[PDB]
């Protein structure tokens, strides 16, 4: 239990910063709308820029942010981790910042 991609209450820009030093175009993190009282969202590096998806709720507890929805945040990650995200290339959610635990 933890969050290898979720953040909590940060600014999309902060997620646009940790995603800018990333290396795999797919790196992602989820943000709880720092401007809202609690609006889920997610930043991800596609090519080098940081585009984010708005996260919504089905009103029952589901979470979505693009096309298909799910029943868990990390669930939407793994899904988009094997499924592309944009119709322009094949990008997927990946791990951002934190480096590969133990990287010098």
């Amino acid at each position: 239990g933890s969050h290898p991609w979720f953040f909590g209450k940060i600014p999309r820009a902060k997620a646009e910063e940790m995603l800018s030093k990333q290396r795999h175009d797919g790196a992602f993190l989820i943000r709880e709308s720092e401007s809202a009282p609690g609006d889920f969202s997610l930043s991800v590096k596609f090519g080098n820029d940081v585009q984010h998806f708005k996260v919504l709720r089905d009103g029952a507890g589901k979470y979505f942010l693009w096309v298909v929805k799910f029943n868990s945040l990390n669930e939407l990650v793994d899904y988009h981790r094997s499924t592309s995200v944009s119709r322009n290339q094949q990008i997927f959610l990946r791990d951002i910042e934190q480096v590969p635990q133990q990287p010098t």
């Binding site: 646009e16 984010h52 998806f53 942010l65 995200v85």
Partner: peptide
């Protein structure tokens, strides 16, 4: 000054 989020509904608001 918000960048929005790719899926984010259009700015129609």
């Amino acid at each position: 000054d918000d960048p929005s989020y790719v899926n984010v509904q259009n700015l129609d608001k």
